[PDB]
């Protein structure tokens, strides 16, 4: 199975430029992104997919800014990036699921944001 360098949670404020939810596989072996599939889930919905065999990314309308850096995928980095407008409306637990042929794995990360009272 795929193993991860885990992070329980990440927090952002309006001081952050981009929201980054980390996901790092420590034992990737594929030498070509065609054999890789990445899926990020939020509240039981697929909110980002990278399908290596089609070389295609898919996001729903409520995560239009979501993406991963495909150039970092063979190193195991499947971190999700998004803008603050998408991030603030979707706080909570995200699941990063990576598949490399018969080897798969998932990890959960909580995206946190705190409303500042003044």
């Amino acid at each position: 199975q795929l193993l991860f360098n885990k992070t329980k949670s990440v927090e952002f404020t309006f001081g952050n430029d981009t929201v980054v939810i980390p996901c790092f596989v420590t034992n990737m072996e594929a030498q070509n992104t065609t054999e890789v599939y990445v899926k990020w889930k939020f509240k039981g919905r697929d909110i980002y997919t990278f399908d290596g065999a089609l070389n295609k990314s898919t996001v729903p309308t409520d995560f239009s800014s979501a993406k991963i850096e495909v150039s970092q995928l063979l190193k195991g980095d499947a971190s999700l990036k998004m803008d603050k407008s998408d991030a603030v409306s979707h706080t909570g637990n995200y699941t990063c699921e990576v598949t490399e042929l018969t080897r798969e794995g998932e990890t959960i990360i909580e995206l946190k944001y705190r409303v500042v009272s003044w």
Partner: antibody
Framework: EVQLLESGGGLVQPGGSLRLSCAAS????????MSWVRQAPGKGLEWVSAISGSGGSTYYADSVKGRFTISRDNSKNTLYLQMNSLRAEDTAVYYCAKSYGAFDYWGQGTLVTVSS | DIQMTQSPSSLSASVGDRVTITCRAS??????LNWYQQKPGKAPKLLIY???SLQSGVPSRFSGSGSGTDFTLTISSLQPEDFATYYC??????????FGQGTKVEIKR
């Protein structure tokens, strides 16, 4: 060695319910997705259900969606299939299998016969 | 969903013959395809995973090839104990990981 021990099959009346069990051993159960595949008499293999290692994601074939529920108890290393509203077309040998993809290990199979 | 077209439906081949079975996927799935051998009323056994890797314990006379949409299972030199129905299976995570129709391999004698 890896073992997948099935139980809970057998004769059941049309419209009835059954709960299949699959006691796994020889591999880290919680690290893998698990599946159920069936074979009706004189028919091919039909994948029917799958569940992620944690149990957070479930998958079903359209032929069983709404009637079957897959679940797992990682503390007991056991996989379940709750089958409700059974019909004559659900008569098949049911197998549990390790993974949801390349099924490397399989249970022995248990015949489920939907008959009065 | 992804549909697999497995061919032929059945074949009869002599002991020592090469057996060739093919599977075509309706979409490009890179190496996400597996092959199984199934004896009647018994659990299938995984032969080839990820289109071209031999599963440990499987005899070297079995091999798989192909990537994308066109896949082939070969038995290089058929042994009498190799009679079975063989199945391809798509396993790309974009769709249900379903089996092909199967090919019944009979021993000609």
């Amino acid at each position: 060695e890896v073992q997948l021990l099935e139980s809970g099959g057998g004769l059941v009346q049309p419209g009835g319910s059954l709960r299949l069990s699959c006691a796994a051993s020889g591999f880290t159960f919680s690290s893998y997705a698990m599946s159920w595949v069936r074979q009706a008499p004189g028919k091919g293999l039909e994948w029917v259900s799958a569940i992620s290692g944690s149990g957070g994601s479930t998958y079903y074939a359209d032929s069983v969606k709404g009637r079957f529920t897959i679940s797992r108890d990682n503390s007991k290393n056991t996989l379940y299939l709750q089958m409700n509203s059974l019909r004559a077309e659900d008569t098949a040998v049911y197998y549990c299998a390790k993974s949801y993809g390349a099924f490397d290990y399989w249970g022995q199979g248990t015949l489920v016969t939907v008959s009065s | 969903d992804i549909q697999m077209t497995q061919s032929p439906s059945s074949l009869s081949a002599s002991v020592g013959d090469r057996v060739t079975i093919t599977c075509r996927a309706s979409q490009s799935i890179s190496s996400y395809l597996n092959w199984y051998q199934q004896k009647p009323g018994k659990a299938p056994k995984l032969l080839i995973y990820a289109a071209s890797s031999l599963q440990s314990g499987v005899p070297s006379r079995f091999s798989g090839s192909g990537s994308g949409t066109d896949f082939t299972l070969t038995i290089s030199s058929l042994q009498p104990e190799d009679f079975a129905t063989y199945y391809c299976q798509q396993m790309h995570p974009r769709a249900p990981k379903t089996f092909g129709q199967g090919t019944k391999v009979e021993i000609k004698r």
